[PDB]
Design an enzyme around this catalytic site. Sequence first.
Site, PDB file in Angstrom:
ATOM      1  N   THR A  40       5.163 -22.950   1.853  1.00  0.00           N
ATOM      2  CA  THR A  40       6.196 -21.928   1.922  1.00  0.00           C
ATOM      3  C   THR A  40       5.682 -20.560   1.508  1.00  0.00           C
ATOM      4  O   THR A  40       6.356 -19.558   1.761  1.00  0.00           O
ATOM      5  CB  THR A  40       7.402 -22.320   1.060  1.00  0.00           C
ATOM      6  OG1 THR A  40       8.486 -21.417   1.307  1.00  0.00           O
ATOM      7  CG2 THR A  40       7.055 -22.288  -0.414  1.00  0.00           C
TER       8      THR A  40
ATOM      9  N   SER B 224       1.159 -16.330  -1.311  1.00  0.00           N
ATOM     10  CA  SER B 224      -0.209 -16.798  -1.413  1.00  0.00           C
ATOM     11  C   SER B 224      -0.675 -17.137  -0.004  1.00  0.00           C
ATOM     12  O   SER B 224      -0.051 -16.745   0.986  1.00  0.00           O
ATOM     13  CB  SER B 224      -0.301 -17.987  -2.376  1.00  0.00           C
ATOM     14  OG  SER B 224       0.549 -19.036  -1.954  1.00  0.00           O
TER      15      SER B 224
ATOM     16  N   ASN C  23      -8.061 -16.185  -7.134  1.00  0.00           N
ATOM     17  CA  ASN C  23      -7.794 -16.887  -8.378  1.00  0.00           C
ATOM     18  C   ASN C  23      -9.029 -17.093  -9.245  1.00  0.00           C
ATOM     19  O   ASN C  23      -8.879 -17.444 -10.420  1.00  0.00           O
ATOM     20  CB  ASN C  23      -7.143 -18.241  -8.094  1.00  0.00           C
ATOM     21  CG  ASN C  23      -5.688 -18.116  -7.718  1.00  0.00           C
ATOM     22  OD1 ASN C  23      -5.259 -18.611  -6.679  1.00  0.00           O
ATOM     23  ND2 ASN C  23      -4.913 -17.449  -8.565  1.00  0.00           N
TER      24      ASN C  23
ATOM     25  N   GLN D 233       5.550 -20.790  -4.547  1.00  0.00           N
ATOM     26  CA  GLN D 233       5.449 -21.142  -5.959  1.00  0.00           C
ATOM     27  C   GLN D 233       4.546 -20.167  -6.702  1.00  0.00           C
ATOM     28  O   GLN D 233       4.782 -19.861  -7.876  1.00  0.00           O
ATOM     29  CB  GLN D 233       4.927 -22.574  -6.083  1.00  0.00           C
ATOM     30  CG  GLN D 233       5.028 -23.255  -7.430  1.00  0.00           C
ATOM     31  CD  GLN D 233       3.707 -23.252  -8.149  1.00  0.00           C
ATOM     32  OE1 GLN D 233       2.664 -23.031  -7.545  1.00  0.00           O
ATOM     33  NE2 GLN D 233       3.730 -23.589  -9.416  1.00  0.00           N
TER      34      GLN D 233
ATOM     35  N   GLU E 136       3.326   6.999   0.915  1.00  0.00           N
ATOM     36  CA  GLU E 136       2.276   8.010   1.035  1.00  0.00           C
ATOM     37  C   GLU E 136       0.891   7.381   1.060  1.00  0.00           C
ATOM     38  O   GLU E 136       0.058   7.734   1.901  1.00  0.00           O
ATOM     39  CB  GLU E 136       2.380   9.038  -0.092  1.00  0.00           C
ATOM     40  CG  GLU E 136       3.509  10.037   0.083  1.00  0.00           C
ATOM     41  CD  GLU E 136       3.579  11.041  -1.052  1.00  0.00           C
ATOM     42  OE1 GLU E 136       2.837  10.872  -2.042  1.00  0.00           O
ATOM     43  OE2 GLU E 136       4.387  11.989  -0.961  1.00  0.00           O
TER      44      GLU E 136
HETATM   45  N1  LIG Z   1      -2.292 -16.194  -9.617  1.00  0.00           N
HETATM   46  C1  LIG Z   1      -1.610 -17.334  -9.578  1.00  0.00           C
HETATM   47  N2  LIG Z   1      -1.740 -18.188  -8.506  1.00  0.00           N
HETATM   48  C2  LIG Z   1      -1.042 -19.345  -8.468  1.00  0.00           C
HETATM   49  C3  LIG Z   1      -0.194 -19.688  -9.505  1.00  0.00           C
HETATM   50  N3  LIG Z   1       0.364 -20.880  -9.210  1.00  0.00           N
HETATM   51  C4  LIG Z   1      -0.108 -21.295  -8.014  1.00  0.00           C
HETATM   52  N4  LIG Z   1      -0.988 -20.358  -7.548  1.00  0.00           N
HETATM   53  C5  LIG Z   1      -1.728 -20.405  -6.279  1.00  0.00           C
HETATM   54  O1  LIG Z   1      -0.876 -20.913  -5.275  1.00  0.00           O
HETATM   55  C6  LIG Z   1      -1.560 -21.838  -4.461  1.00  0.00           C
HETATM   56  C7  LIG Z   1      -0.590 -22.915  -3.995  1.00  0.00           C
HETATM   57  O2  LIG Z   1       0.168 -22.379  -2.936  1.00  0.00           O
HETATM   58  P1  LIG Z   1       1.711 -21.962  -3.108  1.00  0.00           P
HETATM   59  O3  LIG Z   1       2.115 -20.931  -2.084  1.00  0.00           O
HETATM   60  O4  LIG Z   1       1.928 -21.450  -4.509  1.00  0.00           O
HETATM   61  O5  LIG Z   1       2.510 -23.346  -2.933  1.00  0.00           O
HETATM   62  P2  LIG Z   1       3.895 -23.467  -2.120  1.00  0.00           P
HETATM   63  O6  LIG Z   1       3.811 -22.812  -0.765  1.00  0.00           O
HETATM   64  O7  LIG Z   1       5.028 -22.880  -2.916  1.00  0.00           O
HETATM   65  O8  LIG Z   1       4.108 -25.054  -1.956  1.00  0.00           O
HETATM   66  P3  LIG Z   1       4.209 -25.997  -3.258  1.00  0.00           P
HETATM   67  O9  LIG Z   1       2.943 -25.908  -4.077  1.00  0.00           O
HETATM   68  O10 LIG Z   1       4.414 -27.435  -2.849  1.00  0.00           O
HETATM   69  O11 LIG Z   1       5.381 -25.532  -4.088  1.00  0.00           O
HETATM   70  C8  LIG Z   1      -2.705 -22.379  -5.294  1.00  0.00           C
HETATM   71  O12 LIG Z   1      -3.870 -22.459  -4.510  1.00  0.00           O
HETATM   72  C9  LIG Z   1      -2.904 -21.359  -6.391  1.00  0.00           C
HETATM   73  O13 LIG Z   1      -4.110 -20.665  -6.182  1.00  0.00           O
HETATM   74  C10 LIG Z   1      -0.057 -18.834 -10.586  1.00  0.00           C
HETATM   75  O14 LIG Z   1       0.690 -19.119 -11.517  1.00  0.00           O
HETATM   76  N5  LIG Z   1      -0.769 -17.658 -10.619  1.00  0.00           N
HETATM   77  N1  LIG Z   2      -3.042  24.073  -8.407  1.00  0.00           N
HETATM   78  C1  LIG Z   2      -2.238  22.986  -8.328  1.00  0.00           C
HETATM   79  N2  LIG Z   2      -2.439  22.102  -7.322  1.00  0.00           N
HETATM   80  C2  LIG Z   2      -1.666  21.002  -7.199  1.00  0.00           C
HETATM   81  C3  LIG Z   2      -0.597  20.775  -8.175  1.00  0.00           C
HETATM   82  N3  LIG Z   2       0.007  19.628  -7.822  1.00  0.00           N
HETATM   83  C4  LIG Z   2      -0.622  19.162  -6.714  1.00  0.00           C
HETATM   84  N4  LIG Z   2      -1.619  19.981  -6.345  1.00  0.00           N
HETATM   85  C5  LIG Z   2      -2.526  19.803  -5.187  1.00  0.00           C
HETATM   86  O1  LIG Z   2      -1.823  19.265  -4.070  1.00  0.00           O
HETATM   87  C6  LIG Z   2      -2.670  18.378  -3.343  1.00  0.00           C
HETATM   88  C7  LIG Z   2      -1.848  17.180  -2.906  1.00  0.00           C
HETATM   89  O2  LIG Z   2      -0.728  17.651  -2.167  1.00  0.00           O
HETATM   90  P1  LIG Z   2       0.662  16.850  -2.236  1.00  0.00           P
HETATM   91  O3  LIG Z   2       1.321  17.095  -3.568  1.00  0.00           O
HETATM   92  O4  LIG Z   2       0.433  15.375  -2.012  1.00  0.00           O
HETATM   93  O5  LIG Z   2       1.511  17.513  -1.043  1.00  0.00           O
HETATM   94  P2  LIG Z   2       2.923  16.915  -0.559  1.00  0.00           P
HETATM   95  O6  LIG Z   2       2.884  15.407  -0.528  1.00  0.00           O
HETATM   96  O7  LIG Z   2       3.211  17.432   0.826  1.00  0.00           O
HETATM   97  O8  LIG Z   2       4.020  17.374  -1.485  1.00  0.00           O
HETATM   98  C8  LIG Z   2      -3.784  17.961  -4.279  1.00  0.00           C
HETATM   99  O9  LIG Z   2      -5.053  18.219  -3.675  1.00  0.00           O
HETATM  100  C9  LIG Z   2      -3.625  18.811  -5.521  1.00  0.00           C
HETATM  101  O10 LIG Z   2      -4.845  19.503  -5.808  1.00  0.00           O
HETATM  102  C10 LIG Z   2      -0.437  21.783  -9.244  1.00  0.00           C
HETATM  103  O11 LIG Z   2       0.450  21.664 -10.116  1.00  0.00           O
HETATM  104  N5  LIG Z   2      -1.272  22.828  -9.252  1.00  0.00           N
END
Ligand SMILES: Nc1nc2c(ncn2[C@@H]2O[C@H](COP(=O)(O)OP(=O)(O)OP(=O)(O)O)[C@@H](O)[C@H]2O)c(=O)[nH]1
Ligand SMILES: Nc1nc2c(ncn2[C@@H]2O[C@H](COP(=O)(O)OP(=O)(O)O)[C@@H](O)[C@H]2O)c(=O)[nH]1
EC number: 3.6.5.-
Lengths: 432, 430, 428, 49, 33, 15
Positions: free
Chosen positions: A137, A132, A198, A11, A246
């Site tokens: 569930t 959660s 939360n 939920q 990555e």
């Molecule tokens: N951030 C966020 N947390 C929520 C929200 N609604 C419920 N929760 C969290 O969900 C927890 C309840 O567990 P759930 O996994 O959602 O419940 P469930 O497993 O689906 O089981 P039921 O509640 O009976 O449907 C609560 O402790 C809340 O903290 C929401 O809208 N936003």
């Molecule tokens: N000089 C320069 N360095 C770059 C540029 N783009 C990425 N880098 C360098 O590349 C490094 C990261 O490598 P990355 O792009 O992840 O390599 P890849 O994942 O194998 O393609 C960073 O430390 C950057 O400083 C660029 O346009 N100019």
Amino acid sequence: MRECISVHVGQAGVQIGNACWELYCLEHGIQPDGQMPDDSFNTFFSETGAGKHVPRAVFVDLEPTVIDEVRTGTYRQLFHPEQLITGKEDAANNYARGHYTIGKELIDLVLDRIRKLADQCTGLQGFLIFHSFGGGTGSGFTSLLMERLSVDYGKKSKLEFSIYPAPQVSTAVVEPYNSILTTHTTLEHSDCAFMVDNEAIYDICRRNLDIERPTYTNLNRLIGQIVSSITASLRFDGALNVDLTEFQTNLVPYPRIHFPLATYAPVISAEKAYHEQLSVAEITNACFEPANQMVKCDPRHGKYMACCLLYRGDVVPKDVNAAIATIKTKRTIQFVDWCPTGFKVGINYQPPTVVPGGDLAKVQRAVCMLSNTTAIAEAWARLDHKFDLMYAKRAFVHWYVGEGMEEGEFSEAREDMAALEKDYEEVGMDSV
Amino acid sequence: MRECISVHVGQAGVQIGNACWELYCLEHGIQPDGQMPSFNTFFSETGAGKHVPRAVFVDLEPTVIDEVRTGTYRQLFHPEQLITGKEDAANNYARGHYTIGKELIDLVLDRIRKLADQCTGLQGFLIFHSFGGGTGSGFTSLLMERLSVDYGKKSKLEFSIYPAPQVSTAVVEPYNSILTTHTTLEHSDCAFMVDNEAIYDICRRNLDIERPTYTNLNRLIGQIVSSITASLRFDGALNVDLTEFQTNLVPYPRIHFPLATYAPVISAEKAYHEQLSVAEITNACFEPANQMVKCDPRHGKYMACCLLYRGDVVPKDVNAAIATIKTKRTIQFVDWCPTGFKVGINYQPPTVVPGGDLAKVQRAVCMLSNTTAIAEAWARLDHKFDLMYAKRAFVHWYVGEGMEEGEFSEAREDMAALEKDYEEVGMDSV
Amino acid sequence: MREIVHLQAGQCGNQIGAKFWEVISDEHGIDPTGTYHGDSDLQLERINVYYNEATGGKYVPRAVLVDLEPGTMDSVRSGPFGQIFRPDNFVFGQSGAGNNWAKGHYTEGAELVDSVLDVVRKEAESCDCLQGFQLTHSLGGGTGSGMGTLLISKIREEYPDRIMNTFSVVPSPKVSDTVVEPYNATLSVHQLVENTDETYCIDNEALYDICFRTLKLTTPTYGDLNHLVSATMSGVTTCLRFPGQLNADLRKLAVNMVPFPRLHFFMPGFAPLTSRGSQQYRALTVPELTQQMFDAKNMMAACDPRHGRYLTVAAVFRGRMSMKEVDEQMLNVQNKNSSYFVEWIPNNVKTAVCDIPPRGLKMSATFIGNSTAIQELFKRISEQFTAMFRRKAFLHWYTGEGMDEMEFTEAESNMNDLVSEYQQYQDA
Amino acid sequence: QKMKDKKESVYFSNQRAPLGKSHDQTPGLPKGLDILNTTFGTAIVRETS
Amino acid sequence: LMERKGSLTLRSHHKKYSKPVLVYSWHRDRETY
Amino acid sequence: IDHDVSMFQEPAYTL
Ligand SMILES: Nc1nc2c(ncn2[C@@H]2O[C@H](COP(=O)(O)OP(=O)(O)OP(=O)(O)O)[C@@H](O)[C@H]2O)c(=O)[nH]1
Ligand SMILES: Nc1nc2c(ncn2[C@@H]2O[C@H](COP(=O)(O)OP(=O)(O)O)[C@@H](O)[C@H]2O)c(=O)[nH]1
Ligand SMILES: Nc1nc2c(ncn2[C@@H]2O[C@H](COP(=O)(O)OP(=O)(O)OP(=O)(O)O)[C@@H](O)[C@H]2O)c(=O)[nH]1
């Protein structure tokens, strides 16, 4: 052609999906119907020859109330009704009912649907799990979901946007029982489990953003903002593009240690954005602030092991490097000794879009943090202290053991958390 | 480039702040909003045009700052720099250094560690407080201690409204003041000081206006903070940064308490009918009946002065004016100060805050002067602390809010040293 | 008939290579639709080097463009000179590899290198006399290092005398853009030492100091860092593509550089660069031009030559220029500043001048320096390596394809040998 | 009536804590800014390329 | 053989060049010009 | 080294 599939189980997972998907529709021009009035959308949105875009998402939930809400709402014409998988009776905060009795009935349907999502795509990239911890569930069905996706797919990256039960506030009385047992299955094939709570959102929506009385919607729009920032580089051209796999292979230092935190820095109101300057040197300054943190934990009592920086908007590689340079020499933030300079940066040319009726301003630049810390062991140990104290007198067990569970699986979760507590102690020590 | 984050703490603080930032804005042509229909040293900037100021207005009592958040000057200040509490310090230091104000120390220090991050060369912090108050004598002392540990050598100047000679508005003033001048004497590079009673007299002799209000007085104090942070902003011939004031007014270490005196304080009926010259303006700054601190300077050996001229001042005239001042033997100057004059000159003329009491004058001079005549001032205050402490009165409140009865003895003891210090830096040279 | 082939690997290698073909299209004057629209006849006088000639009158760049990430593949395709490339050598896989150095050599690197060298073989046997190969990449990413060094290794199997001219990008001194950069650097340079002949070390922090201080550019983007890199890119091939009174192709720019076959890590540099606010305040003469060459500030590798001795130095030049003072001044920089050059190389610095300028300046130059100060760039990264490897920091991603702990031993031992060579010849 | 019941219920503690809005955006911002079409913060003019 | 696109198949051992372009044989072509 | 002071002397930059 790169795409990834986001399943929203529980939920909490559906309502996060109920508030993050319209952000995905607003970031590419997708109307609530789905007709756009550029292959960017082909990472979450598939194509129909009519010209209309289905989300690459499957919503599985045993409770029928929250799934029928989006079928009768303004998103009746958003999702595929066969993808919208409902159940019949919910697990009801019972891990043994989402894993053994009710959960196994719906696995043959949800796994067949996920196979249909993966079959029609030329190149798949990863998996995004949205659940959660305190649910039934959201805790048990996601346990079946990761046991079967591991054997069916294997080497593909699987990521989790899970919700940690808060250290002080709670919803259910049996949350620690679900939260010690559903982390048993995330310690075997869960590649990287993003963590959020939360109640630290509550402090963010109070101090930084200026609302009192926040509902579920404002929490999940913010969660939708930080999911979008992570995955904006799979769909938009950037100066330093980051792939989903990555940062998966460098944010996780040890296979047991795959629990990074989250942080969205410019969570600012529209009134204050007229006022305060929005440079790159202050947003990355606000990422490290304990108040601007998305898990109720203190970073200064731990050591950062790896950090991932995901920028978007009008940023250039020079001043982000100068900002990281001047903030590394700050003594109040400390890394671990064996890790060298460990930031991974990501630059995107797309600024964040603002939803109408939202609580955020249209900011030119934003940054997301995915930081794996040693400080989360305090959160794990407090939850461990919550579980064994209530399990010592064997409370709430007959519901668990009466639904296909043995008594020893509580014990098997205990030494699994003892191993998950000892390894956090073995990584924070100095190398000598 | 140059920046002066100014933590305005206290009611007198946030009221002095209001009057000060009003002239500070009506001089850099920034409307009460923030958009202009050189100032970076006292006005940060966004992109569109918002010149959000640089300051941490602080006061543990949501009334004297909630008005700054609802009045004309509302947009200017950022809703996150006008921090406020929920419980007053009740004119008792104990609730300013140990309780009540131990929750705001984080919020304020953090708002500060952000106002600085934006700066490139913060040349110094300027706290503005009141010794006779509670927050004024509490979170001021607390902010001072933490600021030093963190920021560091960064000049920590203070503009404080010290207890008046016989005029006062509190009975616990003596205690708070003597206790605040012990936890600050070692954490404040310098401390300009003005007393109310005195400024009232000047706004009755010079500015012929009976029935003065705290606003009228705050304007004179404002036109003094300008003549100190003018060089940092407007341009001029000889310009004096905040660092120079600290090495030209404070002679020995502990003895760091400059006084103050604006000179062309004239009405309008007068101004026009008088040739306010650099000579008449200098003489004024030295005349006992024109000092912003009721402490006749005739009973003291001026340690080191620092005349800061502003307006249309020819450098030659200053040389003459100073030479004549050194001639008269009425003005005495310690032997260990053969020189004793930091001449600063800024071309920007003193502005006229509308509905004020001063009259557009073409010149001006503020003389932060250190005299051994502040010893007498602390003696009156020292006496009115050994009077009550003897009858251990009002010590029930303090000892209850964290404070221990020891810091009271420690306060008088440390202040005895400062009154014995102001005696040795005033004795002749064998 | 002194043709060289282009190689791009990795996102950094692609964008640097993309902006290289931006630059070469200016001096050779080739428009984005491939046609000749220049003026000088000397411009199409040696175009056979970086280009092959024409059905219909256009000049496609001979650049195989390999990157397993297709996101940078269409990004360069949609650029201003992505149209000039041919779709044939757009070799790329739909699968991704997140800095998996093991995958980049044995399972998916092996399944892709056959497709890549099927292109490179076509562009190498089709030429009268191949002069060498040259590759631009990054030492940080897995595609820049894994696909980079695998292509260097298997080319040398059948090419004995064709030189390899790698243009390397080393991780920055202050921070890193990837945490596993010491791992991806150390494993990759274990193949760069044996198989390459010139390795130009580019540093991002070095490029920032040139852009911020000398160029007075407040916010340099990646379209500006690569252009400084592309200036030296065309700088090494100046005399090879244009006549001069003293020419030097890449190969006499090799024997004049490397004393021993392992000392081939060079410092690039571009001499005549000045901010816009001070173009008219500095006189452009070769006495003034070669000072900015030799200062520590205009060095594209972030390690100070003041902490070591130059082994061999060259300076390639452009424009109508006097030969007496270019010879007499490089006397003067050797002899009055002599403690920073090795005493056992007396006639240390060579010149290589050209008659034609670049597009924009009357005379210009490009700096190449082989000094023993670059061991600090390798000593500090072994320190960055031995901190991770003693705790087994990120080994379990690399052991995904079963490369053992034993391979990391000689990966680190190749650096300790290489640093031990550099310290040995520091003191002669 | 609940539309009236909230209209006479304006000058309340709901001023600083409304339902979904933060607190009415008018008096803290200059006139009409068109909050959806305004892009806060400074940018670089990107001259001298 | 699976990828083996036709433009890859079309290889050569000798390359043709235009008349401004200087091949080995360029002095040979201006000599019969 | 012992350049003539009768004409231009040519510069002498360091690193
Ligand atoms: N951030 C966020 N947390 C929520 C929200 N609604 C419920 N929760 C969290 O969900 C927890 C309840 O567990 P759930 O996994 O959602 O419940 P469930 O497993 O689906 O089981 P039921 O509640 O009976 O449907 C609560 O402790 C809340 O903290 C929401 O809208 N936003
Ligand atoms: N000089 C320069 N360095 C770059 C540029 N783009 C990425 N880098 C360098 O590349 C490094 C990261 O490598 P990355 O792009 O992840 O390599 P890849 O994942 O194998 O393609 C960073 O430390 C950057 O400083 C660029 O346009 N100019
Ligand atoms: N110069 C000047 N002095 C003032 C002003 N307002 C009050 N004062 C003086 O401040 C003295 C008391 O100090 P305050 O700062 O008012 O006391 P406080 O502890 O801050 O009061 P609270 O914050 O409400 O607890 C009084 O004796 C006044 O003389 C003002 O506007 N200007």
